[PDB]
């Protein structure tokens, strides 16, 4: 049972691709090809680099062996399925790191907590890492790594409709997300070889665990409109986001992991088209099982009647679009001032270009 | 491998106690003595009587063997602990049946079932069973029977503080209540011998399961103040409770199971004192394990320094009192026109509260 990290913990021949981590369109499929498909090390190698970039090993006296042991066991428990795999976990962790470390035009630093900064971070700009304490940031990064742990390649709706043992176990409520959090935490506690949090006190550890669970459970898209309405409520109230309020910080971390989780349509066309391929291939596996069980095939999941452009157009218009508008309205989107100044925002620019590409595909069909 | 209901499905020797089900202070400990203390049939025998009283077997074409098979398997998986046992499950089912079937002064009433006990044909009474469709009522009754299934005799706080497997499995959220619902439903789906819902269509069955889970999860007292504030909100808004609104009906069913679950302090002194003895004895078992694990003993859980009166006074003042006041303000409390209203349930709660305050005054 004690899966341990490969002998040379840090792989070391990957420097030329790893130095591109500080870009939004990090070429993650070129990293996969450089490491080796199913070498099972992409998540632990990127986790190492981003924890070191933030000085999180010093801040919490994290021993590197136990940390690499855990992140390797975690990445090994992600299945070989087309989308909800360790490559997606790596992508989401990169996205949360990018959203929390990169310059945000006109964001104020909380006047007055222990805070970490990226080595990449060097009046007119702030970053979330300057407003969210190191403990809470580390919880968000670990949540991103564990968020899809042991994903079966089926939706909550499918597990509930088929009375899958997991759906009965979790009373049909956030079935996958409860399982990811519970299975990742059970893995963590199963062996002292995994205990990278040994230097947190008991109060800190219980708070850390609470924050990780809240972040993973926030990735259930059945709650998507509830989180977005709650967040628009906090932004448009008397004081706006209050960075000294622990519940306001939690809600920002949850919006951050939610955006990170569905970042694909807001990447360059090349990345977005590869992730689109991944999710529709996982849907077709589900559509095949639905047919074999005599259920009707869910919309967009029938390989012999694809509606790929309709899926991505409506995903962008109903889910990704409103989440980005809400996050941008809070003033939390990384961007650059244009030389009542305007902001150039790469993330919304990509989402707009991808939306237009899918509408153009629809108008031909 | 399947637990099956005992030889003659219905015990014939219980008639003189079973006819007293239509009283608030049902002598449940006399029923225990008449059956035998761990005979393990009390929940299935009472469930049969209350389902037959409401004509629920005819309304959903329930096969009685599968129904008795399931309720016997369920009652067997309640542990021999002092409070959260099959006797408590029986008590809560009786209380939800009583609150939903018995006359309510000035309640308006319209796929509905009615108790054979419901006589009193004065215009000026209704019952909730006249306002809550039979499918939703049956969900509330089955939830009451399953609400504490496989209870370990420990609080959520103890399971979370000790990183018990169940607390890890449920991410520290409503750990016991998720387990009761999940373990009860797993038992149901485990055997065709248990499928008493076979004549519900697929839409009905999915709705039924949703309602049962919502009712069991509502018994977590971490949510108590949220439910009470939400209910007072719906009662004091422009239209009040709207019986044609499915979310208003669910919230009434959840207030009903919540009151049924903590009914003890609103029973006659004799019943209330036996239930109080049960809960403090279960707490002491928890305090013993806390000491052995080197944890500080939780408040009220120390056998060598009991604080029974302080426990019950503050439980009634903080939890039971405000829930009864809120349910009574909605006009949903069973009672009799004297015209003012005599309400047995609130009169018992007031008398038991005064009894504990008087005990404290000596200590
Ligand atoms: C129903 C939402 N959903 C299932 C979990 C989903 C997940 C991810 C993506 C997805 N689409 N485009 C990408 O670039 C990659 C991911 C974010 C799309 C959907 N969807 O059903 O539409
Ligand atoms: C606070 C909730 N609780 C422990 C889970 C509890 C349950 C039942 C009773 C109990 N009190 N009085 C009775 O008559 C029987 C039951 C409801 C009391 C408590 N409590 O901690 O106060
Ligand atoms: Mg997920
Ligand atoms: Mg309970
Ligand atoms: Mn994900
Ligand atoms: Mn109970």
Author numbering:
A (entry chain B): 669 to 780, 799 to 808, 812 to 1028, 1068 to 1093
B (entry chain A): 669 to 778, 800 to 1027, 1069 to 1093
Please give sentences taken from the publication describing this entry.
DNMDP and related compounds, or velcrins, induce complex formation between the phosphodiesterase PDE3A and the SLFN12 protein, leading to a cytotoxic response in cancer cells that express elevated levels of both proteins. PDE3A is a well-characterized cyclic nucleotide phosphodiesterase (PDE) that hydrolyzes cAMP, cGMP, and cUMP8,9. Here, we show that PDE3A and SLFN12 form a heterotetramer stabilized by binding of DNMDP. Moreover, we demonstrate that SLFN12 is an RNase, that PDE3A binding increases SLFN12 RNase activity, and that SLFN12 RNase activity is required for DNMDP response.
To gain insight into how DNMDP induces complex formation of PDE3A with SLFN12 and how trequinsin inhibits this interaction, we solved the high-resolution crystal structure of a modified form of the catalytic domain of PDE3A (PDE3ACAT-Xtl) in the absence or presence of DNMDP or trequinsin. PDE3ACAT-Xtl is comprised of residues 669–1095 with two internal loops between residues 780–800 and 1029–1067 replaced with shorter linkers to aid in crystallization and improve diffraction quality of the crystals. The catalytic domain of PDE3A crystallized as a dimer with two dimers in the asymmetric unit. In the DNMDP-bound structure, DNMDP binds in an extended conformation with the dihydropyrazidinone ring buried deep in the active site pocket. This orientation is stabilized by hydrogen bonds with H961 and Q1001 and a series of hydrophobic interactions along the length of DNMDP. F972 and L910 also pack against each of the ethyls of the diethylamino group of DNMDP, which are positioned at the entrance of the active site pocket. Indeed, the melting temperature (Tm) of PDE3ACAT increased by +3 °C in the presence of DNMDP, indicating that DNMDP binds and stabilizes the structure of PDE3ACAT. However, they do not reveal how DNMDP promotes SLFN12 binding, as DNMDP does not cause any obvious structural changes in PDE3A. We hypothesized that the interaction with SLFN12 is stabilized by contacts with the exposed diethylamino group of DNMDP and inhibited by the trimethylphenyl group of trequinsin.
